[PDB]
Design a protein around this ligand. Structure first.
Ligand SMILES: CCCCCC/C=C/CCCCCCCCCC(=O)O[C@H](COC(=O)CCCCCCCCCCCCCCC)COP(=O)(O)OC[C@@H](O)CO
Ligand SMILES: CCCCCC/C=C/CCCCCCCCCC(=O)O[C@H](COC(=O)CCCCCCCCCCCCCCC)COP(=O)(O)OC[C@@H](O)CO
Ligand SMILES: CCCCCC/C=C/CCCCCCCCCC(=O)O[C@H](COC(=O)CCCCCCCCCCCCCCC)COP(=O)(O)OC[C@@H](O)CO
Ligand SMILES: CCCCCC/C=C\CCCCCCCCCC(=O)O[C@H](COC(=O)CCCCCCCCCCCCCCC)COP(=O)(O)OC[C@@H](O)CO
Ligand SMILES: CCCCCC/C=C\CCCCCCCCCC(=O)O[C@H](COC(=O)CCCCCCCCCCCCCCC)COP(=O)(O)OC[C@@H](O)CO
Ligand SMILES: CCCCCC/C=C\CCCCCCCCCC(=O)O[C@H](COC(=O)CCCCCCCCCCCCCCC)COP(=O)(O)OC[C@@H](O)CO
Ligand SMILES: CCCCCC/C=C\CCCCCCCCCC(=O)O[C@H](COC(=O)CCCCCCCCCCCCCCC)COP(=O)(O)OC[C@@H](O)CO
Ligand SMILES: CCCCCC/C=C\CCCCCCCCCC(=O)O[C@H](COC(=O)CCCCCCCCCCCCCCC)COP(=O)(O)OC[C@@H](O)CO
Ligand SMILES: CCCCCC/C=C\CCCCCCCCCC(=O)O[C@H](COC(=O)CCCCCCCCCCCCCCC)COP(=O)(O)OC[C@@H](O)CO
Lengths: 191, 256, 111, 23, 52, 52, 55, 23
């Protein structure tokens, strides 16, 4: 019974390793515990102070995390890859049909009726089957920026929504950014 | 490869020792209670809990005196001497009172449990009790295990209470910070569920580890007068590595 | 045995004193009890840094707490629900008359 | 009434909000 | 030598994890090496190594 | 205790710099600026001789 | 089963040395390299606060 | 090229001179 007791002593150690990696996942130090997180990316001109595993917020409520920051020396603009969230940065059929019948009439409005050929919302049928698969709540002209969490805290990425009729698919590049505010060169002008 | 074979034989017997101690614990906590077992538990609360009350009280006062003296020197240079009660109470409640009170429990009440059970094994009171028809795991071992799981979380609350009283005594009454700002900054930033209850959850995990090691090493001892003394220094080493090892895992979950 | 049961009873008295000191002198526990508090809600565009169980003040006097903060991703403005109080924010018998006559007077003035 | 919605708000003011005010 | 080496590593891991959470809210994450080394050198390394 | 303090700083550098992502050059330069040898390192050895 | 005692004794010494090589790596002690770095230079008039091994 | 000298610099600005300017 030296083998029956040795097998229990190995099972206790493997259970103590599995509890360790479950604790690191819950703590946030390794892995990604959110909700079916898809991936977006964006290109800034100054990301000083932004670290990986940082925060992405929409109106103050956390919707994502940062993955990696690389430089790309041919254009010399940093490229921040961040993964957001499926549960609360998108919508489902009740809200999705609520913007299915919205975007058909608003894009084909009283102006755009007499602007194309007589399809009579035939092209509005084509656009809505491209809508439902992989769409976000981020409109086409929201801009992302690097904010600073108080007066002295760390830096995060803030998505400021506004306007917009089209919406962004899962995986695109947000095309309006602004980087961190260099508080050196603000005072350099003010003298 | 003469010592390499000795090193590999050493860590195999230690792996097998965790398997015996795991099956010994599942046999204690999964069994029915019996007759006269509550009165044996109240007797062992006197030997484990009340005997440890004097080392815990004086060591908590001495640690709170150092925290209020060192924490004043940091905070006075940034104009935040009113946050002295916040940093004294939050250092004890989440770091120092679960950990330092478990290192003095493993030394006093842990090493005395493995000497009492181990001398019952040498003088053959455990073999005489078994041949009568009484299980010594229920009569002897099981009151001593439950009295340590209850007494250590009751002793870190007394550790943290005198550490704050000792830090208030050097901060307010000797270095001269405002008394009303000491308690009001503490009542603002210290929460009960996140800071006080999370310190009790730590000391219940430590009390299970410190007592299961101390009880196992006396039962699976070597009934020989320097086989008992080898076991008493194994419960101080193995409990201190488990307290400091599980402390990193619990702060990364609770405060990370 | 009559001493050892007497001494264990003192170890439970000193534990109960220290849990009393930790809960009701060091924490904010005794100061969270609202008197027949109702519930309102507001809708913001930046709630960054606002935690649950935060504070609501009128003139510097705390009159409530904060319950829950969610997105509403159809309008994308954050929605905070907060619960106020009965005594410090709702009127009573004498005060209701003191605003009922003036609300008619502010209405049916010369203007 | 009890249970309504306060309809005039303004959110937090972080460091980038304080700067764009002064300019 | 084996209890002292492993216990010193586990304590430095907690100090760097707790000390980052304090300093990052006041914009002083560059003082992490100062507070880790000064907590050990004057308080924790004489005392905890004498209790083991 | 000198071996205790040396691995505690190595363990705190490993979680701070290599996992939480602070700058490595600012970790050691802030340490070499505020930590003195006679006042902080030798005063920790004088403690551990009294304790020993 | 001497071969099982011979193997677990080897893994303990292998893991014990590989911890030591990883300890001297996470510290200025030996190494501290950079991916084929060339070297530039510049001329200032005030560098007050700049220290070697900055970024 | 690798090894050259960047011939456009500007040094640091201490907080004493900042006040000096802001009188
Ligand atoms: C069923 C309940 C399971 C609950 C536990 C879950 C976690 C399991 C992991 C570790 C548990 C260790 C507790 C062991 C309890 C029995 C202790 C014991 O006694 O076992 C000893 C093993 O050492 C030892 O504990 C090793 C002692 C040092 C430990 C150092 C490592 C601690 C680091 C922990 C990291 C956190 C991981 C867990 C987080 C989820 C060996 O005994 P010996 O006397 O040498 O054998 C006798 C012969 O050698 C004669 O000479
Ligand atoms: C950003 C989020 C901020 C935090 C919000 C929380 C607000 C504060 C309110 C309440 C505090 C919650 C904090 C987490 C509590 C830790 C729970 C825990 O750590 O669980 C402990 C596991 O310990 C062990 O195994 C050692 C094993 C450790 C690995 C266990 C992994 C835990 C994973 C589940 C915990 C969920 C965490 C919820 C917090 C977000 C069990 O503790 P006990 O009940 O004493 O069991 C007694 C033992 O003898 C077991 O028999
Ligand atoms: C504002 C001033 C800032 C400070 C400036 C100092 C600058 C840093 C440079 C150097 C560090 C000096 C700091 C004081 C040093 C403490 C000396 C001390 O504490 O002395 C110790 C006494 O300890 C014991 O008795 C326990 C007894 C303790 C009571 C001893 C009282 C000491 C009084 C004389 C010390 C003069 C202090 C000078 C500092 C201003 C002796 O230590 P050891 O040599 O190991 O003797 C070994 C023992 O086993 C005795 O056999
Ligand atoms: C990946 C997750 C890691 C944690 C999960 C593991 C959880 C289960 C734990 C299992 C413990 C292993 C059990 C078999 C080994 C037996 C332990 C042992 O053998 O115990 C001690 C050594 O433990 C020791 O190294 C401490 C033993 C643990 C070693 C840990 C130290 C290295 C870990 C690296 C740290 C991670 C981050 C840093 C990476 C660079 C031996 O001390 P002794 O010299 O005999 O003292 C003499 C007295 O005892 C006699 O009077
Ligand atoms: C989440 C679920 C609960 C958490 C526990 C989880 C752990 C797993 C389950 C544990 C409970 C299972 C029930 C079975 C318990 C088995 C232990 C047992 O049953 O031990 C008994 C001891 O009594 C005893 O309960 C010891 C007597 C009581 C000990 C505890 C006393 C409680 C008082 C403090 C409680 C703290 C609450 C305070 C809150 C502020 C019996 O021992 P003996 O009579 O001496 O035997 C002798 C004879 O057989 C031969 O001589
Ligand atoms: C100046 C602004 C910072 C406040 C000063 C202060 O009050 O000092 C406190 C330091 O001790 C804290 O709390 C963090 C509390 C634990 C401090 C680190 C633990 C000390 C021991 C480290 C590990 C040693 C292992 C155990 C000893 C053997 C930090 O408290 P705040 O920062 O207020 O925040 C409150 C919480 O939300 C977390 O921050
Ligand atoms: C709001 C803040 C909350 C804080 C709450 C308050 C905190 C707790 C407050 C006080 C706790 C005090 C601790 C009391 C210790 C009780 C110990 C005890 O009561 O144990 C006794 C023995 O203690 C013994 O050794 C005698 C033990 C040694 C005696 C002590 C001698 C040192 C003191 C003399 C020197 C003076 C100090 C120097 C000052 C200048 C029991 O006697 P035993 O013969 O072993 O057992 C007998 C049994 O078989 C049957 O009865
Ligand atoms: C710049 C930074 C500075 C830092 C400097 C570096 C710090 C130091 C680095 C490393 C120090 C390592 C410590 C080495 C320990 C040496 C102990 C030793 O060497 O002791 C030996 C026994 O150790 C024994 O028990 C064997 C002891 C237990 C074996 C350990 C088993 C646990 C490990 C296995 C589990 C793996 C860990 C889990 C990881 C996932 C001696 O054998 P004995 O028969 O007792 O005496 C024989 C004498 O009579 C004559 O010879
Ligand atoms: C905020 C910016 C201020 C720096 C923050 C910081 O880095 O915290 C550092 C904390 O380490 C320090 O010494 C204080 C060092 C000791 C910290 C407290 C020690 C923990 C334990 C207290 C005593 C119990 C003993 C341990 C129990 C086993 C201090 O750094 P500075 O203030 O720069 O200089 C420190 C000295 O000059 C005196 O002030």
């Amino acid at each position: 019974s030296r083998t029956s007791e040795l097998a229990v002593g190995i099972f206790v150690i493997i259970f103590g390793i599995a509890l360790f990696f479950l604790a690191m996942k819950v703590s946030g130090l390794v892995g990604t515990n959110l909700s079916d997180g898809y991936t977006m990316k964006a290109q800034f001109d100054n990301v000083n102070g932004l670290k990986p595993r940082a925060k992405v917020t929409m109106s103050g409520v956390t919707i994502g995390r940062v993955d990696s920051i690389t430089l790309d020396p041919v254009t010399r603009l940093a490229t921040v890859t961040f993964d957001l969230d499926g549960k609360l940065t998108s919508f489902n059929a009740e809200q999705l049909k609520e913007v299915q019948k919205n975007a058909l009439d608003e894009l084909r409005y009283s102006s755009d009726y007499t602007q194309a050929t007589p399809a009579q919302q035939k092209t509005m049928e084509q656009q809505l089957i491209s809508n439902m698969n992989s769409i976000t709540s981020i409109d086409e002209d929201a801009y992302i920026m690097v904010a600073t969490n108080g007066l002295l805290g760390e830096k995060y990425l803030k998505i400021v929504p506004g306007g917009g009729l089209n919406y962004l698919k899962r995986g695109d590049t947000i095309s309006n950014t602004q980087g961190t505010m260099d508080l050196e060169d603000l005072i350099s002008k003010f003298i | 490869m003469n010592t390499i074979a000795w090193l590999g034989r050493l860590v195999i017997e230690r792996i097998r020792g965790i398997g015996v101690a795991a099956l010994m614990l599942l046999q204690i906590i999964f069994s029915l209670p019996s007759a006269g077992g509550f009165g044996r538990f109240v007797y062992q609360m006197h030997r484990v809990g009340v005997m440890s009350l004097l080392i815990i009280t004086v060591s908590g006062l001495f640690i709170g005196l150092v925290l209020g003296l060192q924490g004043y020197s940091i905070l006075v240079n940034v104009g935040s001497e009113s946050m002295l009660g916040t940093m004294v109470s939050l250092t004890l409640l989440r770091e120092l009172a679960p950990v330092v009170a478990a290192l003095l429990f493993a030394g006093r009440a842990g090493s005395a449990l493995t000497a009492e059970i181990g001398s019952m094994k040498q003088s053959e009171q455990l073999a005489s009790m078994e041949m009568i028809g009484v299980d010594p795991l229920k009569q002897i071992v099981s009151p001593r295990l439950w009295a340590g799981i209850v007494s250590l979380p009751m002793l870190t609350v007394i550790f943290a209470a005198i550490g704050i009283v000792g830090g208030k005594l050097v901060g307010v009454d000797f270095l001269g910070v405002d008394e009303g700002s000491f308690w009001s900054g503490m009542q603002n930033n210290v929460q009960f569920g996140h800071d006080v209850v999370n310190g009790i959850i730590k000391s219940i995990v430590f009390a299970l580890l410190c007592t299961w090691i101390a009880v196992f090493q006396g039962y699976a001892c070597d009934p020989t007068p320097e086989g008992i003394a080898t076991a008493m220094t194994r419960t101080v080493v193995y409990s201190s590595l488990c307290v400091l090892g599980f402390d990193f895992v619990l702060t990364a979950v609770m405060f990370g």
